[PDB]
Amino acid sequence: PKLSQDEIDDLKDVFELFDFWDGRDGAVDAFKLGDVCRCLGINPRNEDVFAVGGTHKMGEKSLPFEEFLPAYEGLMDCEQGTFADYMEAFKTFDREGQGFISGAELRHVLSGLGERLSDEEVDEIINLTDLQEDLEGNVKYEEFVKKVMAGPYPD
């Protein structure tokens, strides 16, 4: 809350880039706004977006800059996860502690539990991040939790 001018800025500059990809007319479709903030840093969740507008159908409700901006201010807050947090999820699955998870199982979580990730994603995600199996056919979650958090652009 209380953005700045190096902050409120990269917002409109993005809202703009996203107002054009659904027709330049001064507004942005809700649904596609959860994908506005992502690019803008924060990592809100489905519920999170919904609970401020984020429709399900594309073309149900379209927010104009201001009327949109506010709901962006409140997504920042939302419980943004963390290693230790993430790191645990995969562990309660590590029936060995060795630090692995049958990709099988792994692609099960991301797919099955919680907020299901499009089966479209995952493969995608694990494929840029590059998540190569290994002998056993399982993965070492750790390096992945890091990779995913590192953002697409590392060092």
Partner 1 sequence: MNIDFNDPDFQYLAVDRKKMMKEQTAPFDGKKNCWVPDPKEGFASAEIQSSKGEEITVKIVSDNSTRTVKKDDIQQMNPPKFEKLEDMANMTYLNEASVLNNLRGRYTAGLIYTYSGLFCIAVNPYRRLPIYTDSVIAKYRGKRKTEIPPHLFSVADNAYQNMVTDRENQSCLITGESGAGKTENTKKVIMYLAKVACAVEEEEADQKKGSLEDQIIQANPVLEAYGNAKTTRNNNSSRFGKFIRIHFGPTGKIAGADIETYLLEKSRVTYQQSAERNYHIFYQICPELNEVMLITPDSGLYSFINLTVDNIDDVEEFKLCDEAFDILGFTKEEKTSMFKCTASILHMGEMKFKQRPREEQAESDGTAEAEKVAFLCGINAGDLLKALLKPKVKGTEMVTKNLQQVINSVGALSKSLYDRMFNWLVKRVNRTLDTKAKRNYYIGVLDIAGFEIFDFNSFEQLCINYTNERLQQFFNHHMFVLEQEEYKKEGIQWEFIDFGMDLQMCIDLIEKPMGILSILEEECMFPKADDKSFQDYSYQNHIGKNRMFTKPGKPTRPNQGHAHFELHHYAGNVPYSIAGWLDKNKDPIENVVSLLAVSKEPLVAELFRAAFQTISAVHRESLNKLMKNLYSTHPHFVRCIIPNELKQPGLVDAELVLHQLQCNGVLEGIRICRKGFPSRLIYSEFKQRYSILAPNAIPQDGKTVSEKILTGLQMDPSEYRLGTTKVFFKAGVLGNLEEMRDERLSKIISMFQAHIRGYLIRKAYKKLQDQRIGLSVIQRNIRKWLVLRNWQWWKLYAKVKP
Partner 2 sequence: MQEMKEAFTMIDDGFIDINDLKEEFSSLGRTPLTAMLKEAPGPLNFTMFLSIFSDKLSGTDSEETIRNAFGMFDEDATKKLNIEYIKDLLENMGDNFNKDEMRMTFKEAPVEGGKFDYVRFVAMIK
Judged by CB under 8 A, the chain residues 13 through 72 that form the site for partner 2 are 20-24
The 10 Å Cβ neighbour count of residue 36 is 24
Alpha-carbon torsion (118, 124, 128, 132), positive or negative? positive
Question: Of residues 5, 6, 66, 92, which one binds partner 1 by CB under 8 A?
Answer: 92
Residue carrying structure tokens 């949109």: 68
Residue environment code for 40-58, b if the CB has 16+ CB neighbours within 10 A, otherwise e: beeebbeebbeebbbbeee
Do the annotations mark residue 23 as ligand-binding? yes
Judged by CB under 8 A, the chain residues 26 through 65 that form the site for partner 1 are 35, 37-39, 41-48
Instruction: Name the DSSP class of 99.
Output: S
Do the annotations mark residue 9 as ligand-binding? no
Cβ at position 16, least distance to partner 2 in Å: 12
Residue environment code for 113-138, b if the CB has 16+ CB neighbours within 10 A, otherwise e: eeeeeeeeebeebbeeeebeeeeeeb
Cβ at position 97, least distance to Ca ion in Å: 50
Instruction: Name the DSSP class of 56.
Output: S
Which partner in partner 2, partner 1, Ca ion, none is near 81 (CB below 5 to 8 A by kind)?
Answer: partner 1
Q: Which residues bind partner 1 (CB under 8 A)?
A: 17, 20-21, 35, 37-39, 41-48, 79-89, 91-92, 95, 109-110, 113-117, 121, 124-125, 128-129, 145, 148-149, 151-152
Detail the residues annotated as belonging to a binding site for Ca(2+). 19, 22-23, 25, 27
Q: Which residues bind partner 2 (CB under 8 A)?
A: 20-24
